[PDB]
Design an enzyme around this catalytic site. Structure first.
Site, PDB file in Angstrom:
ATOM      1  N   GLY A  22       0.822  -1.206   0.000  1.00 44.53           N
ATOM      2  CA  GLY A  22       0.000   0.000   0.000  1.00 44.53           C
ATOM      3  C   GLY A  22       0.853   1.251   0.000  1.00 44.53           C
ATOM      4  N   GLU A  23       0.240   2.424   0.217  1.00 44.25           N
ATOM      5  CA  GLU A  23       1.019   3.650   0.339  1.00 44.25           C
ATOM      6  C   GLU A  23       0.323   4.733   1.156  1.00 44.25           C
ATOM      7  OE1 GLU A  23       0.445   4.185  -4.308  1.00 44.25           O
ATOM      8  OE2 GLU A  23       1.719   5.812  -3.539  1.00 44.25           O
ATOM      9  N   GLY A  24       1.039   5.253   2.162  1.00 42.60           N
ATOM     10  CA  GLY A  24       0.641   6.443   2.906  1.00 42.60           C
ATOM     11  C   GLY A  24       0.799   7.720   2.105  1.00 42.60           C
ATOM     12  N   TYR A  26       2.883  10.200   2.090  1.00 38.67           N
ATOM     13  CA  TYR A  26       4.220  10.579   1.582  1.00 38.67           C
ATOM     14  C   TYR A  26       5.230   9.390   1.523  1.00 38.67           C
ATOM     15  CZ  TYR A  26       5.435  11.227   6.599  1.00 38.67           C
ATOM     16  OH  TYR A  26       5.665  11.053   7.946  1.00 38.67           O
ATOM     17  N   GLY A  27       4.720   8.189   1.213  1.00 38.04           N
ATOM     18  CA  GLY A  27       5.569   7.066   0.858  1.00 38.04           C
ATOM     19  C   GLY A  27       4.901   5.705   0.766  1.00 38.04           C
ATOM     20  N   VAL A  29       4.713   1.346   0.873  1.00 38.38           N
ATOM     21  CA  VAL A  29       5.162   0.134   1.586  1.00 38.38           C
ATOM     22  C   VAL A  29       5.198  -1.074   0.651  1.00 38.38           C
ATOM     23  CG1 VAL A  29       4.746  -1.436   3.533  1.00 38.38           C
ATOM     24  CG2 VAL A  29       4.378   1.019   3.805  1.00 38.38           C
ATOM     25  N   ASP A 139      -2.965   7.524  17.001  1.00 40.26           N
ATOM     26  CA  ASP A 139      -3.694   7.106  15.782  1.00 40.26           C
ATOM     27  C   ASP A 139      -3.974   5.585  15.798  1.00 40.26           C
ATOM     28  OD1 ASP A 139      -5.101   7.692  13.426  1.00 40.26           O
ATOM     29  OD2 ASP A 139      -3.296   7.554  12.172  1.00 40.26           O
TER      30      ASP A 139
END
Ligand SMILES: O=C1NCc2ccc(-c3nc(NC4CCOCC4)ncc3Cl)cc21
EC number: 2.7.11.24
Length: 344
Positions: A22-24, A26-27, A29, A139
């Site tokens: 996946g991806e957050g 600003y980057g 995985v 979080d």
């Protein structure tokens, strides 16, 4: 360098055979095969150096995770980055690869009461350690609870974590907030910056409710709708709980609302263990001062088959009070913080 989805994912030759996860914001995985310790691993690409707030959050996360060592908290196994600051555009964080997360599990699988109990025990055991280090996760949510094939649980994503600061928790009504909406405690919308440990307990309570029914308990669609949902189940705050809200805008907002009755937990969760609902009630207490703390939660009768304080470790080295530093100084600190993982 290895490519993935129109991004360099530059982690070789130790780490090969990449797949996207996946991806957050600003980057990205990926999973990868670790050719030294012969196992697949998880790798997060982080690209924070254009922005000071992204630098701050990357540095905080790295510092926290490198300090922490706990069975119920994801560690950092390795950090990959260029040998010089000049060449360093990205940082890659290598962590244990987990099979799934609690968000994916809840979307597909009914949990037995024994699984709920074990998951909740591990969440709280990890959280005891985090809180003992004077850190708030801030979080906690199902997608940040990773699981392996035998249901061991690890808390991840310390990107919004902060050192606890209860004496500076107060703020105005409807102050903007960063953490995930459905797991936000009512006080965030009223008068809190989310700098006290009670913020994390509320989120765990939301998680427990979600494990009981596979559905989020308070799925607000926007900032003040989140409080609409909370109050629709807890009912109207008591006079005593209102008296603790000194800010007039927040107090008068609550006073303006029609009376709302409490929805009994056993009506919402008719198949739930009574002891799980008693603990749920104490985690989802409106007044954060009255909300159960992590060590009390662990000692709750629901968890009696697991509870063992001698096997619920605390942190050796808690954190104390780094927010006016510009992004260039923060790059030098990230470069310094990651230096132990380089060749040489
Ligand atoms: O810190 C993070 N923020 C965004 C993120 C995504 C993923 C991970 C992560 N995921 C996995 N396993 C996936 C496999 C597929 O099912 C979901 C879990 N294992 C380790 C990490 Cl470290 C960590 C973070």
């Amino acid at each position: 360098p290895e490519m993935v989805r129109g991004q360099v994912f530059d982690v070789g030759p130790r780490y090969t055979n990449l797949s996207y996860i996946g991806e957050g914001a600003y980057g990205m995985v990926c999973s990868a095969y670790d050719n030294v310790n012969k196992v697949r691993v998880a790798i997060k690409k982080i690209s924070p150096f254009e922005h000071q707030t992204y630098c701050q959050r990357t540095l905080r996360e790295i510092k926290i995770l490198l300090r922490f060592r706990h069975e119920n908290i994801i560690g950092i196994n390795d950090i990959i980055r260029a040998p010089t600051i000049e060449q360093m555009k990205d940082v890659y964080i290598v962590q244990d690869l987990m099979e799934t997360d609690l968000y994916k599990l809840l979307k597909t699988q009914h949990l037995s009461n024994d699984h709920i109990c074990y998951f909740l025990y591990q969440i709280l055991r990890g959280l005891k350690y985090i809180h003992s280090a004077n850190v708030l996760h801030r979080d906690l949510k199902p997608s940040n609870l990773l699981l392996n094939t035998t249901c061991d649980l690890k808390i991840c994503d310390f990107g919004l974590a902060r050192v606890a600061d209860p004496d500076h928790d107060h703020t105005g009504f409807l102050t903007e907030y960063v953490a995930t909406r459905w797991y936000r405690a009512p006080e965030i919308m009223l008068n809190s910056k989310g700098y006290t440990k009670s913020i994390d307990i509320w989120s765990v309570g939301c998680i427990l409710a979600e494990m009981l029914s596979n559905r989020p308990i308070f799925p607000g669609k926007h900032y003040l709708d989140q409080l609409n949902h909370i109050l629709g189940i807890l009912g109207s705050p008591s006079q005593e709980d209102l008296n603790c809200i000194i800010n007039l805008k927040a107090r008068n907002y609550l006073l303006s609302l029609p009376h709302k009755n409490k929805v009994p937990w056993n009506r919402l969760f008719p198949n739930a263990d009574s002891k799980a609902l008693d603990l749920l009630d104490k985690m989802l207490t409106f007044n954060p001062h009255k909300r159960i703390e992590v060590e009390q939660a662990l000692a709750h009768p629901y968890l009696e088959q697991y509870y063992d304080p001698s096997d619920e470790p605390i942190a050796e080295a808690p954190f104390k009070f780094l927010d006016d530093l510009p992004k260039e100084k923060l790059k030098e600190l990230i470069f310094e913080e990651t230096a132990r993982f380089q060749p040489g």
